[PDB]
Amino acid sequence: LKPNAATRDQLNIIVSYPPTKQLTYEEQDLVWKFRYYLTNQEKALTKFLKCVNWDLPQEAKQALELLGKWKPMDVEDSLELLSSHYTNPTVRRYAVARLRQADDEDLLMYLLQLVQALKYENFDDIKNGLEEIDSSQIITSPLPLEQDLCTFLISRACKNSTLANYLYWYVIVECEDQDTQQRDPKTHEMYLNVMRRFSQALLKGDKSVRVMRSLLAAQQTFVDRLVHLMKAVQRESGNRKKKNERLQALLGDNEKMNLSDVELIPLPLEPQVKIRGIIPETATLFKSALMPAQLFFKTEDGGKYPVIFKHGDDLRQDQLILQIISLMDKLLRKENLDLKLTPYKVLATSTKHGFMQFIQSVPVAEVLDTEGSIQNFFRKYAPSENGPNGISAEVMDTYVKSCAGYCVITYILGVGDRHLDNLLLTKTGKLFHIDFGYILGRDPKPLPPPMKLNKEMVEGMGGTQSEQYQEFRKQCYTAFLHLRRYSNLILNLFSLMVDANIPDIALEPDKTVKKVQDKFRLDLSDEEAVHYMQSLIDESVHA
Ligand SMILES: CC(C)OCCN1c2nc(N3CCOCC3)cc(=O)n2CC[C@H]1C(F)(F)F
């Protein structure tokens, strides 16, 4: 059945929709009517499967015939199929089948999301792969369209130690989730079962695979002791100076604790890095009443890898935000735009605790209290006689680019609660944000601005009249156009976090993807979208 040119155009309009537009009944009947003609368009499948009422068995059987005939879909479109809209096991098996096609570098960037996608999988299939229960005991307690998702994730994790590490911790944290346990116990089991299947699949494996399981256990052991240590510190009476002496005391006793000297284990935060232990003498606590701890790991090479370990806090929102920023930055760099971003690593070792890579830097606030100005600061540490305003070209260039990158990205992610506390600067010129407590348009104060600039950022570029500021403008709109090309991917990825119990998403799960989708101004053309960003910057700077 071949549609006439007038409708072919109408079909094209429909397929051009954001994966998050809800098609009308008229619109579905039309896409359904010409489903066979649409088979050509990889792009059209997703909208086709939106046209099906999966509760009608014959309609599902019918749809599934086509799936097997359709131009096969992209990787980025497959993440649409693993969301909650789709319970149909054949569909979800079709999605996994096209994710197989992706490289592990790419899987990693969506893995946080895919672990959530487990929630929509078939719990009976998962459990019957096996051959009250503390999730963290499982690895430490070893017994002496064909694939679903669980099988696939484990199969790939068995071949790739980096992937396995994240799979392991992402699932632990899903197991640890108190809310899921009370409100969806069956889901809690599904995750226990996944961990047990992972544990099981490792032990079945060859020499190298089995060692991966020892490693994962050693890490979980490591973290259990760190946690215990932190509790001891957080109960210690008296001033912070006194509470530091306890943290250092305990790290240093390897009999009791085992934390200063160990056989090389992957760092859970960045498992490419392996670590001999924590250096006791330099451990300290931040001022915060939560008492997160700064801690220098000795790496394999005798380098230092400082982290923050937070105990009593849920890092999952922050984890997500840095996972996204990381992906945004990979994408930009694929399109040859390296904005000197600081996608620092975040990893939750539980709902109650986790790690953060600690980047050597100075809060802009401190920069003010010590050197008066971002430019003065740069003239102290990165002086040049030839360079702009007394400052090394490279340093200013880095600063302009990163200023632009965050400006866009923090706008797109509606990151609020911004202060000179959260805004950090690097003697190499790198500017970056931290502490993502409020996102997607929340803020402690009312009427938050949509663009997150300030007098101090602008001044360090040399005011609105400088060559730098023009380059800033230019890098923003350019970054905005690049990120718009990936709106599909980014939107699918947030779309998989609706049940993830991320505070700012769990207010209005139903309504969060649109919050992000609106920032992209997908209604505007690229050229119009450039003038939108320039407007935005103008308003902001005028206030
Ligand atoms: C330096 C100090 C003022 O900053 C506050 C430290 N700090 C913090 N540092 C982060 N950085 C990660 C990236 O490298 C830099 C540090 C990330 C982050 O989320 N936070 C949250 C608030 C406080 C703390 F201590 F309570 F956790």
Numbering used by the authors: 286 to 416, 439 to 451, 471 to 869
Paper text:
Here, a series of new methods are presented based on the use of a low X-ray-background film as a crystallization support and a photoablation laser that enable the automation of major operations required for the preparation of crystals for X-ray diffraction experiments. In this approach, the controlled removal of the mother liquor before crystal mounting simplifies the cryocooling process, in many cases eliminating the use of cryoprotectant agents, while crystal-soaking experiments are performed through diffusion, precluding the need for repeated sample-recovery and transfer operations. We have previously shown that the transfer of crystals to X-ray data-collection pins can be automated through the so-called CrystalDirect approach, which relies on the use of a thin, low X-ray-background film as a crystallization support from which crystals are recovered by excising the film with a laser beam and attaching it to an X-ray data-collection pin. The CrystalDirect system enables the automation of sample mounting and cryocooling and can contribute to closing the automation gap that currently exists between crystallization and X-ray data collection.
Femtosecond photoablation lasers, such as that used here, produce little or no collateral damage to the sample owing to heat conduction or shock waves. This property can be exploited to separate individual crystals growing in dense clusters or to eliminate flawed parts of a crystal with surgical precision. A series of ablation experiments performed on thaumatin crystals confirmed that the effects of ablation do not propagate through the crystal. This approach was applied to the analysis of crystals of the catalytic subunit of the human phosphoinositide 3-kinase Vps34 in complex with a specific inhibitor. We used the laser beam as a surgical tool to cut and extract a portion of a rod-shaped crystal from a cluster of densely packed needles. Helical X-ray data collection performed on this sample on the ESRF ID23-2 microfocus beamline resulted in a high-resolution structural model providing insight into Vps34–ligand interactions.
